[PDB]
Design a protein around this ligand. Structure first.
Ligand SMILES: OC[C@H]1O[C@H](O[C@H]2[C@H](O)[C@@H](O)[C@@H](O)O[C@@H]2CO)[C@H](O)[C@@H](O)[C@@H]1O
Length: 431
């Protein structure tokens, strides 16, 4: 289905404040007459690239920033054009998360970091260390409860522990990521995953626990602690559990190092509604009133808009969010992040199951994370890229098409990639 002109379709994850976003959409419609439809499809981070590659999909995509370099390199994202005066309204550290190869590729919305969330009735003082959690579990088990439940199906939640004593995604030096140097199989990563697997082997956690199961257990007062982000606070408030949000536990005397996400909004390169999307994002969503509507539905975290974050940062739950963020890393946004996350997802699930050792799981993850296709020689690759750039500038009269094709040129790695992109450019017809 072609993207409808004179309408905005927005995709956002189902754990986010989509109903509040729809309220901002209602205001946009009141003022402009343009309908805004918000959807939250399953497997969004996969659905978007698959559908947008066909030239279709939502006008606006929301996800954490880590996936956006890959979307941009695939030609799925428009270059955004915020004026300096608009840029000044948002924190510089959030703009840096949505810059790729020298250009802005999305609008930053809010900073997400995992925290330890604990039930103050069950546990007045939260543990400072991971190592003390088995003993805590033993006492809570005696009471028919447990110490800790969190999602073991998404490696986002386990990463802070894997990273604590030295695990890393890609080596980051001189401001550049070396995609051949993956750190998921070093001593630190092994130690962190081993600790997780031991918690499971010793019946302090269950490998099958997912988002829904952990949330229900915490929100029904069955488990003393969970690990989650700001979006989860709404449902805890509803449950009336008396909870705190705090610094993650240390492991081997090192802070846990969560990978920090910036919820970001990109504009589909194929959208015929780029100006409407800019108007909605800049002048409806990224305002005190817009962010309040979304935040009241599900908390966004530490919002990128200075004027509204001034108020939200009073909250100790936001202070704890940023305490954790400061101990972790803003995620890379490079295209290889998808392969990294696949590799670690697989390793955590397989090791947690008890059917594969940690060392075997992480050895495979190291190989899986760095996997890439054949490379042309550097000389040949530069010649292909320069050919395509000149071809695009000569032959593609539509600006958005030129801009997306030039981003695609950045991702070619070999002669086959060159030939395929050449075919895409030559086949292009009147817009
Ligand atoms: O588990 C890997 C997954 O981690 C991150 O996804 C987070 C997302 O950032 C949060 O906004 C929240 O929704 O939970 C997700 C984990 O289920 C990465 O952003 C994502 O790319 C990656 O696959």
């Amino acid at each position: 289905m072609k993207i409808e002109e004179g309408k905005l379709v927005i995709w956002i994850n189902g754990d986010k404040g989509y109903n509040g976003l729809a309220e901002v959409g209602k205001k946009f419609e009141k003022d402009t007459g343009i309908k805004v439809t918000v959807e939250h499809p399953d497997k969004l981070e996969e659905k978007f690239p698959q559908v947008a590659a066909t030239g279709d999909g939502p006008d606006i995509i929301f996800w954490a920033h880590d996936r956006f370099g890959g979307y941009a390199q695939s030609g799925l994202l428009a270059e955004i054009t915020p004026a300096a005066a608009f840029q000044d309204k948002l924190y510089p550290f959030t703009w840096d998360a949505v810059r790729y190869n020298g250009k802005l590729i999305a609008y930053p919305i809010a900073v997400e970091a995992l925290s330890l969330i604990y039930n103050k009735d069950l546990l007045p003082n939260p543990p400072k260390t991971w190592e003390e959690i088995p003993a805590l579990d033993k006492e809570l088990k005696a009471k028919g409860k447990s110490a800790l439940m969190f999602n073991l199906q998404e490696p986002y939640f386990t990463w802070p522990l894997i990273a604590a004593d030295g695990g890393y995604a890609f080596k980051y030096e001189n401001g550049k990521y070396d995609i051949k140097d993956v750190g998921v199989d070093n001593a630190g990563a092994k130690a962190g995953l081993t600790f997780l697997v031991d918690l499971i082997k010793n019946k302090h956690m269950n490998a099958d626990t997912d988002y829904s199961i952990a949330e229900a257990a915490f929100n029904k007062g069955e488990t003393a602690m969970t690990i989650n982000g700001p979006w989860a606070w709404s449902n805890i408030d509803t449950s009336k559990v008396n909870y705190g949000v705090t610094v993650l536990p240390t492991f081997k005397g090192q802070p846990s190092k969560p990978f920090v996400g910036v919820l970001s909004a990109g504009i589909n390169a194929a959208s015929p509604n780029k100006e409407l999307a800019k108007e909605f994002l800049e002048n409806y969503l990224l305002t005190d009133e817009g962010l309040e509507a979304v935040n009241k539905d599900k908390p966004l975290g530490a919002v990128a808009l200075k004027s509204y974050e001034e108020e939200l940062a009073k909250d100790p739950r936001i202070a704890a969010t940023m305490e954790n963020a400061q101990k972790g890393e803003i995620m890379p946004n490079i295209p290889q992040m998808s392969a990294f996350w696949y590799a670690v997802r697989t390793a955590v699930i397989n090791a947690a199951s008890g059917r594969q050792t940690v060392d075997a799981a992480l050895a495979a993850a190291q190989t899986n994370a760095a996997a890439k296709s054949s490379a042309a020689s550097p000389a040949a690759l530069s010649g292909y890229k320069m050919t395509l750039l000149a071809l695009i500038k000569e032959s593609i009269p539509n600006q958005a098409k030129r801009q997306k094709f030039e981003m695609q040129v950045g991702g070619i790695r070999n002669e086959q990639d060159f030939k395929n992109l050449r075919r895409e450019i030559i086949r292009s017809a009147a817009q």
